[PDB]
């Protein structure tokens, strides 16, 4: 278990308690509990790329004290 940070949409930083084996979907569920944002509206970004729901924090080399960046669900067109 470890702490990570999420910079939410307004720039406010929150702290989450996670495990390296937690999926991005689990992280979005934790953000929903803290912030009231539906997971389908959450787009998490790390190292400039969006994080896919089915992958784990470990898959993305997200470590203790890392910061994920939350933006809104988006679609190119």
């Amino acid at each position: 278990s470890m702490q990570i940070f999420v910079k939410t949409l307004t720039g406010k930083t929150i702290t989450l308690e996670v495990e390296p084996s937690d999926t991005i979907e689990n992280v979005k569920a934790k953000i929903q509990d803290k912030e009231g944002i539906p997971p389908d509206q959450q787009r998490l970004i790390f190292a400039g790329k969006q994080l896919e729901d089915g992958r784990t924090l470990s898959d993305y080399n997200i470590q203790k004290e890392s910061t994920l960046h939350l933006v809104l669900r988006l679609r190119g067109g």
């Binding site: 307004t10 406010k12 912030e35 009231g36 944002i37 539906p38 509206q41």
Partner: protein, 62 residues
């Protein structure tokens, strides 16, 4: 305790956060009543969660 609750409206940066955007049983409070009412009048979604705005509640902190 919400340390950012005392910061100004994130939209206009000039008024307190007293316009609660209500959707279902939850609310997002980050704008003043004036800015939030503009969004409701124009039928815009909630800025942070995109759920439809059911009402704006003028929020007081007793």
């Amino acid at each position: 305790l919400p340390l950012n609750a005392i910061e100004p409206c994130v939209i206009c940066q000039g008024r307190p956060k007293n316009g609660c955007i209500v959707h279902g049983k939850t609310g997002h409070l980050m704008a003043c009543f004036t800015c939030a009412k503009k969004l409701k009048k124009r039928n815009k979604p909630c800025p942070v969660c995109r759920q439809p705005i059911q009402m704006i509640v003028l929020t007081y902190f007793p």
